[PDB]
Design a protein around this ligand. Structure first.
Ligand SMILES: Cc1nc2c(-c3ccc4nn(Cc5cn[nH]c5)cc4c3Cl)c[nH]c2cc1CN1CCNCC1
Length: 506
């Protein structure tokens, strides 16, 4: 659960909540109401409230006087199970999440929505067990739970399904369905009736199986959807996606081993065990030779990806072992080697025309070709002692992404991804496309999600369903924190919009 995040609270509201409703060890996180990508962890200690800044420019959550993390849920989990210190160096304990009652970031909460608007959506878009909660209109301050129940098999409105409305009273900021338990929030109420469904007198079980899906759109409707989300609506949609990251706390035990600690660019940004790339055929003398900070990303609903960090000096040999083993023939690099004077990826390829050995692997840089937004390096990768293992690996190095934030226009990213796509498609049986930035989650996640969405539209044309948050959530189940900021989220929509618009101009 992610109840400790309060989306619509000020700093002074946060202090007053912790001092009146919390104890020492209580904590909550909140966004800056202005500067986006700024968050604050507010913590009660010795009867007073401290505020700790968390910045995200696109690559990771950077907690002041703490560490860097892939998600705020992973940050909270780390500190609640271990470390966090103030400037004078004193320990700040995160013991007791201070829960938020605001329903605005729940997928099922649709706010103003009228009752006829709600029946039409559940009828057209909904399925058995699809539900939503909306404000009443007839009884102001109260709410309505609308639920669809029925036989999904039919392709006609033949009375085999129906919508039921359940009035939710709000009496003294507790919520109830007219009887029984009174809940501190709509979330507690929905969670209760999700496990213990209401039964009608004549037997119908009002099963709350899934929130109504309103984010799946026809690709042709993209421009209208961007217009609706710009009236922001992008913020609400993104924060609803972020609220689901508590469902993605999969184990990362391999990355936590002592033997593997120094193979991580950031100690707490780690690959999930279940999708990590396992390196085989290692040196028998190296005790733990199977680890790289990289995950297979397999779109689920033909191309797959490996999402990885920028190489460290001590992982370059591992990186080439990964590329060789997986039969990857295309690398996508989305950072400069150095940004803001700090190393984001070591140079792991030879100079133009040069040959280098990286342990058992040999790489030739055959030729570099410079475009406005990117450099292409044609590399030849082989295993030392086995000349018939040579294959070309095409390295696409995107060089113009801004140091902070996202490109103001998606055209360059789209032209780059189109080229990468055609390269990959031209090579029979090519393995996954390797995509890396610095930590391998922010830019890397953005490029991979764009590529996925654009691949649907390229094969099906403008009449295909896409669902941006659903696709992100699927990718975030395979590597932590894929797509870091609201700015990248909006950029994904803008890239899909631009891609559609240029397909209609052709
Ligand atoms: C309905 C809705 N959905 C979303 C998602 C969204 C979509 C689809 C997802 N599917 N899954 C599971 C999964 C498994 N594999 N892949 C995805 C999670 C998903 C989320 Cl979080 C992100 N923002 C959203 C906003 C809304 C509507 N808002 C109205 C205003 N008040 C807040 C609600």
């Amino acid at each position: 659960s992610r109840r400790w995040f309060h989306p619509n609270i000020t700093g002074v509201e946060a202090e007053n909540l912790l001092l009146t409703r919390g104890v020492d060890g209580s904590f909550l996180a909140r966004p800056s109401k202005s500067n986006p990508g700024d968050f604050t962890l507010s913590v009660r200690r010795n009867g007073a409230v401290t505020h700790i800044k968390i910045q995200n420019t696109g690559d990771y959550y950077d907690l002041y006087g703490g560490e860097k993390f892939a998600t705020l849920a992973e940050l909270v989990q780390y500190y609640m199970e271990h470390q966090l210190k103030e400037k004078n160096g004193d320990v700040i304990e995160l013991k007791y999440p201070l829960n938020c009652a605001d329903p605005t970031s729940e997928r099922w909460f649709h706010g103003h929505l009228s009752g006829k608007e709600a029946e039409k959506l559940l009828t057209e878009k909904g399925k058995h067990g699809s539900f939503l909660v909306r404000e009443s209109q007839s009884h102001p301050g109260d709410f309505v739970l609308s639920v669809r129940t029925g036989d999904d098999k039919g392709e006609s409105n033949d009375g085999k399904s129906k919508v039921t409305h359940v009035m939710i009273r709000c009496q003294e900021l507790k919520y109830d369905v007219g009887g029984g338990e009174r809940f501190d929030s709509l979330t507690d109420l929905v969670e209760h009736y999700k496990k213990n469904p209401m039964v009608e007198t004549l037997g119908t079980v009002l099963q709350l199986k899934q929130p109504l899906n309103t984010t799946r759109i026809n690709a042709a409707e993209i421009e209208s959807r961007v217009r609706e989300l710009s009236k922001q609506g992008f913020w609400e949609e993104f924060e609803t996606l972020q609220q689901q990251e508590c469902k993605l706390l999969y184990s990362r035990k391999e990355g936590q081993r002592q033997e593997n600690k120094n193979k991580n660019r950031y100690k707490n940004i780690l690959p999930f065990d279940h999708t990590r790339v396992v390196l085989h055929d290692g040196d028998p003398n190296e005790p733990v030779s199977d680890y790289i900070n990289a995950n297979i990303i397999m779109p689920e609903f033909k191309k797959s990806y490996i999402a990885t960090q920028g190489c460290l000096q001590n992982t370059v040999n591992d990186f080439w072992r990964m590329v060789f083993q997986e039969n990857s023939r295309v690398i996508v690099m989305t950072t400069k080697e150095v940004e803001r004077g700090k190393s984001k990826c070591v140079k792991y390829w030879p100079d133009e025309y040069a040959l280098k050995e990286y342990g058992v692997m040999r790489v030739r840089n055959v030729k570099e070709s410079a475009a406005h937004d990117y450099t292409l390096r044609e590399l030849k990768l082989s295993k030392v002692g086995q000349g018939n293992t040579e294959r070309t690996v095409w390295q696409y190095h995107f060089r113009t992404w801004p140091d902070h934030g996202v490109p103001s226009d998606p055209g360059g990213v789209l032209d780059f991804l189109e080229e990468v796509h055609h390269k990959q498609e031209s090579i029979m049986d090519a393995g996954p496309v390797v995509v890396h930035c610095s930590a391998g989650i922010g830019r890397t996640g953005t490029f991979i999600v764009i590529d996925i969405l654009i691949d649907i539209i390229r094969e099906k044309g403008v009449d295909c369903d896409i669902d941006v948050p659903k696709t992100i959530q699927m990718v975030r189940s395979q590597r932590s924190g894929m797509v870091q900021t609201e700015a990248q989220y909006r950029f994904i929509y803008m890239a899909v919009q631009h891609y559609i618009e240029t397909l209609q101009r052709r």
